[PDB]
Design a binder for this molecule. Structure first.
Ligand code: IBM
Ligand code: MG
Ligand code: ZN
Length: 519
């Protein structure tokens, strides 16, 4: 029934599937951080058994509990410290967690018929509320626990392959416009984020450089807010959007080029490496701090995404849709979580920076603005505000608009990647859409699923041919989306920012191919 993690000799075989005994709280924590390295949602309840030199290991139970509750909320944990109430709680949680469609229903609050659910499973409203109402004292204690983990956990060791060869490969992967996101593990992707954010931080003048371990801790925490079982809106998508923004900013001159940068965006990915394990560097619209703010916003722009759409949340009266009055439902959620859960604890000093010495506009506000701009329901207004701007805004609102436009472009950049990679994204987006349709049918009682089994997928094919064979008609989704959203956005942005014209070039190349096989 449950995965049991113990710091003591007690056994609870009545509810135990697999039991892990840990010598230290630090090693238990490391086990938990690695759970988001996989491609699947954790689908079993986790019981942690506590007792009735390391600072982590010697924390009072109140602080150990606070750490687990806050940093590992996503893992469906029940904490005990030495039968009927336990068994029923775990049994109920297991019944609700096993199946993907059940999990999405739980998180979104749309399958009530089927606080934390069973005291264990978090919902979007629970997490949103917890982070909005947290006291100053609680906030400072979490900051202390975070710094404690940075002090005592060597995060590079939590990646499966941190060899010199692999790290160099990732530098070159980051350098390709044909970013091979689907060939990178969630561990690989963590290092990719480090490469890009570290590179950006180094360009910011009045701003200290942050050690490898501290950046990695932050990124592990970000990864932990994405749902690994989302076929599309997962940490891979976050890093991909970050990487697209990264390329945009390099090509606009907001960041310098680096030795591993691949100049020609139309090339497919080739696996390259050398002896370097970080990016080696060689007026712009956005200055160094705005550039960093944008990249950070891209990283966090879908945090906590439950694998649905605004339309689903609105039409099925999801609690978060009710909170947000149907207005930018998921994006409001992402912005609130990213700021109040992640950045407030992990990087509070970034939130209080301003976009320039003269400006009162904070990086917090810029991040919020940019994240909110990714709502496709507001797509037309950002396009019109761009066309009005091209034909006036003060500096602050100019920075907001440019940032908004770049993050919008990055968010839907899968259609501007070279065909093969673009097709892989199309396929996983189709998987997620199919899950949403299944969830709707479950809620409407148009289908009865076996909730004792989980949804599993074969790997995304490497080659375009196999993708087209697995689902022909991929073309019509791409044609629809390019005609109604992408073409107009990238053309308009490239008119303002000529360096991004290559995006329009690739879109057309892809469109012509999709139109070809429509015939
Ligand atoms: C977020 C989503 C509804 C928008 N959307 C879409 O509908 N299709 C078909 C795509 O290929 C796509 N790529 C990014 N966003 C996309
Ligand atoms: Mg989004
Ligand atoms: Zn997104």
């Amino acid at each position: 029934m449950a995965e049991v993690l113990s710091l003591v000799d007690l056994e609870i075989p009545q509810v135990t599937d697999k039991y892990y005994k840990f010598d230290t709280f630090k090693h238990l924590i490391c086990h938990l951080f690695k759970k988001t390295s996989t491609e699947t949602d954790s689908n079993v309840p986790i019981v942690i058994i506590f007792p009735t030199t390391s600072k982590l290991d010697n924390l009072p139970f109140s602080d150990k509990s606070l750490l687990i509750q806050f940093f590992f909320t996503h893992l469906n944990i029940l904490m005990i410290q030495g039968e009927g109430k336990l068994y029923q709680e775990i049994s109920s949680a297991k019944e609700l967690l096993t199946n993907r469609i059940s999990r999405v229903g739980n998180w979104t609050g749309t399958t009530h018929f089927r606080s934390k659910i069973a005291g264990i499973i978090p919902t979007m409203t629970y997490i949103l509320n917890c982070n909005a109402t947290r006291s100053e004292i609680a906030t400072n204690q979490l900051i202390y626990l975070y710094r404690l983990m940075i002090e005592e956990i060597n995060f590079i060791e939590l990646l499966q392959d941190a060899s010199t060869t692999r790290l160099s490969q990732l530098c070159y992967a980051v350098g390709h416009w044909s970013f091979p996101a689907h060939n990178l593990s969630n561990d690989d992707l963590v290092y990719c984020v480090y490469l890009m954010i570290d590179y950006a931080i180094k360009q910011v003048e009045g701003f200290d450089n942050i050690p490898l371990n501290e950046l990695l801790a932050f990124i592990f925490i970000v990864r932990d807010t994405y749902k690994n079982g989302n076929p599309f809106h997962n940490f891979r998508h976050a890093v991909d959007v970050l990487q697209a923004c990264f390329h945009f900013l390099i090509r606009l001159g907001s960041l310098p080029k680096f030795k591993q940068f691949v100049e020609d965006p139309k090339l497919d990915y080739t696996e390259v490496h050398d002896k370097h394990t970080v990016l080696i560097a060689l007026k712009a619209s956005l200055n160094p701090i705005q550039t960093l703010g944008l990249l950070v916003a891209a990283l966090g722009h879908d945090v906590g995404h439950p694998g649905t759409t605004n339309d689903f949340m609105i039409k099925f009266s999801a609690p978060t849709a009710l909170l947000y009055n149907d207005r930018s439902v998921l994006e409001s959620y992402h912005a609130s979580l990213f700021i109040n859960k992640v950045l407030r604890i992990c990087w509070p000093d970034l939130l209080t920076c301003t976009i320039e010495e003269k400006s009162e506009l904070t990086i917090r506000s810029l991040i919020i603005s940019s994240i909110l701009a990714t709502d496709m329901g507001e797509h037309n207004e950002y396009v019109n505000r761009l066309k009005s701007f091209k034909t006036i805004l003060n500096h602050d609102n100019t920075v907001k608009l440019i940032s908004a436009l770049l993050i919008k472009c990055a968010d839907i950049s899968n259609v501007t990647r070279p065909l093969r990679v673009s097709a892989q994204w199309a396929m996983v987006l189709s998987r997620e859409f199919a899950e949403v349709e299944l969830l709707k049918s479950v809620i409407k009682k148009d289908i009865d699923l076996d909730f004792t089994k989980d949804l599993t997928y074969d790997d995304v094919p490497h080659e375009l041919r196999e993708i087209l064979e697995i689902q022909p008609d991929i073309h019509k989704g791409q044609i629809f989306f390019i005609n109604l959203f992408a073409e107009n956005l990238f053309n308009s942005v490239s008119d303002l920012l000529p360096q991004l014209q290559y995006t329009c070039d690739i879109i057309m190349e892809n469109k012509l191919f999709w139109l070809e096989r429509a015939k």
